[PDB]
Amino acid sequence: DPHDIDPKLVQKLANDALVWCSLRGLLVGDRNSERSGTVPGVDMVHAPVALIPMSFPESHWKQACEVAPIFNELVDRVSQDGEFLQQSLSRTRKVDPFTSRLLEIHSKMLEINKIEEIRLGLHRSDYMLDEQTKLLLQIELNTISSSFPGLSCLVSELHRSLLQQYREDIASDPNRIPANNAVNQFAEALAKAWNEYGDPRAVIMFAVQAEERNMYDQHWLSASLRERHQVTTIRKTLAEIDALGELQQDGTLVVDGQAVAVIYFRAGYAPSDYNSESEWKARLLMEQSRAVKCPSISYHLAGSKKIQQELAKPNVLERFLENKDDIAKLRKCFAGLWSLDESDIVKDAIDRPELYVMKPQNNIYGEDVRDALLKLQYILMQRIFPKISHSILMREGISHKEQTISELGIYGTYLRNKTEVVINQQAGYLMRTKVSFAVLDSIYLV
Amino acid sequence: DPHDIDPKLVQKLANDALVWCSLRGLLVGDRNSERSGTVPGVDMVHAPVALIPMSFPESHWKQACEVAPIFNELVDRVSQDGEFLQQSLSRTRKVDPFTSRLLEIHSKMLEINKIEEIRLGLHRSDYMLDEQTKLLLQIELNTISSSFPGLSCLVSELHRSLLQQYREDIASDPNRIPANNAVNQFAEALAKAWNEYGDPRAVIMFAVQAEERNMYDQHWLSASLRERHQVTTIRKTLAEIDALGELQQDGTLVVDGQAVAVIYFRAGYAPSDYNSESEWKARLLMEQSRAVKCPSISYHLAGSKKIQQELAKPNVLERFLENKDDIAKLRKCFAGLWSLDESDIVKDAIDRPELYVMKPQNNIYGEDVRDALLKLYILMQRIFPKISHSILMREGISHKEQTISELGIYGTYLRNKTEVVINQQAGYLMRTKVSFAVLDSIYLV
Ligand SMILES: Nc1ncnc2c1ncn2[C@@H]1O[C@H](COP(=O)(O)OP(=O)(O)O)[C@@H](O)[C@H]1O
Ligand SMILES: Nc1ncnc2c1ncn2[C@@H]1O[C@H](COP(=O)(O)OP(=O)(O)O)[C@@H](O)[C@H]1O
Ligand SMILES: N[C@@H](CCC(=O)N[C@@H](CS)C(=O)O)C(=O)O
Ligand SMILES: N[C@@H](CCC(=O)N[C@@H](CS)C(=O)O)C(=O)O
Ligand SMILES: [Mg+2]
Ligand SMILES: [Mg+2]
Ligand SMILES: [Mg+2]
């Protein structure tokens, strides 16, 4: 129990954790700096981290890893069914201007029979463990800008080194922290995608935000690409891509005199990244190009919460997958999922709101679900009640003893060309722990 | 020529250099932060670095590496001659209160026949290359708190990676940057010293300053000690050592319930580290202990500029070394060196001050040497290095500057009763500065 640890020992652990982060690149830009998100190497601070790894059952860890390749294949097959995406999201588009514009781009790609022969997925599936039922249940599937493959790897090593250093003071087995190689598996998948594209002069472009205090996480990927696969990367905003990008007659994307083989998005997932029309033109320009997108417009739309909800309905998974065991494994991870047009469920949410969460496609919980639904006269989800644990959280040099809940992310790499699937695997993990703000964590298997 | 590089390419190099530093621990505490020197992991900035490695002749690099083990042996033999240190520094002690107190501690160790059977040296010998004569000449020998073994290693890798990444844009051979493993060779020497001490529960104590913006350099050493040799380290100030330190009957130093096998000093080299009597008692406490000191009081005094100057005088090197080739190799590195009691030299410095530097044992150059001597410290031959072009990175900003450079060679030395266990060159440091200073590496030509 971390709250029982002597404060003298917490301070020593804290100092050693802070030193380790500083020497090993587990860093973010400081939130109180105007420069830390634009100029690398200035106003840096350790990434917010748990001081001790979070206990997590191995059985459920294994379950999460086992479904990763099934979700990866599912995302790919869902994305190929253009009409399914358009049908599922047609109510969303009248109320959400952002989704509507994404669907416009998708529509334009279907109008010209655009084919993505090489398709790359860099996913993270996020889970919570329900205390009472002991079920690992999916909270979401990220198909765009999956954060922390760089940093989560380091947190595993941080915790393993701390437990090794303090064996005399804390009783543990450091081998209970599982190996986490997400950054290099992500780098490998990006490199193989570049390799399938077949241009030895081409680069991988990172589409990034103008201000990015999590730049070091992204730079860990590009460092792995350069040092382990000799692939060049560039960083550009959507505005910069509009200004500096054009298409050649064959559809090759050229950005500042360099051919772009792969586009890896760490931006363009929210309306606020699209400051003007320039950013939307850039998005459309990239999509019609011959480049490998991660994600493509299809893959992006496939990660929508509305799609997650449609995939839970009877017979829908059987449209996309033939293997009945794989389907059963996915359904074991599904919490209850519903739209506001399922009126029996809306009435039930009004009668028993404590059991539901109302999630936009700013979450609403408990008593407030009743009020919001009554005003309306968004998706509805089974409320998950995780274990509230004790942990010690580090932020800006200061240790805090806190009541926390945790959330397990499983990274997934997927790559296919015309006939063949080249990569489809689980690719490491993320544990995020937060107060009942959030920190990076790892797992200690029990 | 770095000044001819297109500004678009400088910016790309700069960004890649800054990223690399951030991911690979080439960091210092920010100078404009009240916390960066006391709280690790906050208000950090890349270490000031050259963007491009400095050109340096291989012949002179080799000369510098070849004399490293001779200096290491010399420091050891000079330190054993207690009466030589006391005689050489007896004029210094009446005018410098700090040196006098160091000599008091030494005197007390000689009074009780204190023997250091295990002697550890972590040295850096600093050189400048004279443009006109083409001579590598020693500027000083550091026997205490030799900075940058952690960071200088990283700068070599930084430059090698940049040159590798930009082969299409800059014509170079990255293999011309020599391998630099100073941090791990320093760690190994500290680990072997701990091993000779023979206590598997004992720790290596770092004696450190209360505020230290170069903490990450030091932490690289302790990280190497923990991860590659399973030796624990602690960090303590001199005041903390006075408060938390005692001696057992057999002379074992215990600091906060932990036996201390090796004391590695990154403090206690200047008067301002001794805020009160507490710090002096701590220094005396550690010296009389059974622990391996790096440096011992003898080794500390042996690195004095006055000793450097005495070692340059006729027949003195022949007191300590028997091999005439080794002596000749050292004398080839010596610039002219003199004390203020050599009156012929003082008069000459008054007549031709431009040729001299007046160095305290705050340096004085040129015209000002005349004025200071007329008002009335060592006198040294002024060395005139090559003024080069380079690009310096500080706080995220690249500066094109006129620079001079300074080569440091690290040296590891370890002996027990009979045997010398380690005596080698142990990597390098290149510091480059405006005609402020940055870390650099070498590109051999
Ligand atoms: N079904 C659920 N039950 C309980 N808590 C949930 C559920 N879904 C999400 N949460 C909580 O809300 C947080 C946000 O998750 P999500 O809604 O998927 O992303 P966002 O914060 O971007 O809206 C989660 O970290 C989790 O703590
Ligand atoms: N003989 C010399 N000729 C020219 N410059 C010198 C000479 N000695 C020292 N310097 C310059 O002065 C700086 C500081 O002197 P140094 O002897 O290293 O003492 P400290 O490290 O205490 O400042 C050196 O980095 C070097 O650039
Ligand atoms: N811009 C941030 C992305 C932050 C973010 O919120 N990412 C979401 C997916 S949009 C995640 O769940 O990781 C980055 O690139 O690191
Ligand atoms: N206290 C700082 C600085 C020490 C320092 O400047 N040392 C001098 C010799 S005292 C050197 O030449 O490296 C550190 O430990 O890094
Ligand atoms: Mg999603
Ligand atoms: Mg010097
Ligand atoms: Mg010296």
Residue numbers in the entry:
A (entry chain B): 14 to 374, 380 to 395, 405 to 463, 474 to 483
B (entry chain A): 14 to 374, 380 to 394, 405 to 463, 474 to 483
From the primary publication:
Glutathione, the tri-peptide γ-L-glutamyl-cysteinyl-glycine, is the main low molecular weight thiol antioxidant in both plant and animal cells, often present at millimolar concentrations in vivo. It is synthesised in a two-step, ATP-dependent, process: glutamate-cysteine ligase (GCL) catalyses the formation of γ-glutamylcysteine (γ-EC) from glutamate and cysteine, followed by the addition of glycine by glutathione synthetase (GS) to form glutathione. Cyst nematodes have exploited a series of gene gain events to redeploy glutathione synthetase-like enzymes during parasitism, within the syncytial feeding cell formed in the host root.
For comparison, the only GS gene in the corresponding plant host of G. pallida (Solanum tuberosum, St-gss1), was similarly expressed and its product purified. Using this approach, the maximum rate of the host GS (St-GSS1) phosphate release was 7532 (±1358) umol/mg/min, consistent with a previous report for Arabidopsis GS of ~7500 umol/mg/min, demonstrating the suitability of the assay. St-GSS1, Clade 1 Gpa-GSS1, and Clade 2 Gpa-GSS5 all exhibited a strong preference for glycine, and a high affinity for γ-EC. Residues in the ATP binding pocket of St-GSS1 are highly conserved in sequence and position in the Gpa-GSS22 structure (13/15 residues), and similarly conserved in sequence across G. pallida Clade 3 (structure guided alignment, ~12/15, n = 24). The position of γ-EC in St-GSS1 is coordinated at both the glutamate and the cysteine residue. Two of the three residues that coordinate the cysteine interact with the C-alpha backbone. Corresponding residues in all G. pallida GS-like effectors are not conserved in sequence but are preferentially small and uncharged, while the third residue, arginine, is 100% conserved: consistent with permitting interactions with a cysteine residue. However, the glutamate of the di-peptide is exclusively coordinated by interactions with charged side chains of residues in the binding pocket (R, E, 2xQ, N, and Y). All six of these positions are substituted in Gpa-GSS22 and Gpa-GSS30, thus suggesting that the lack of canonical activity is because γ-EC is not accepted despite the potential for cysteine to be accommodated.
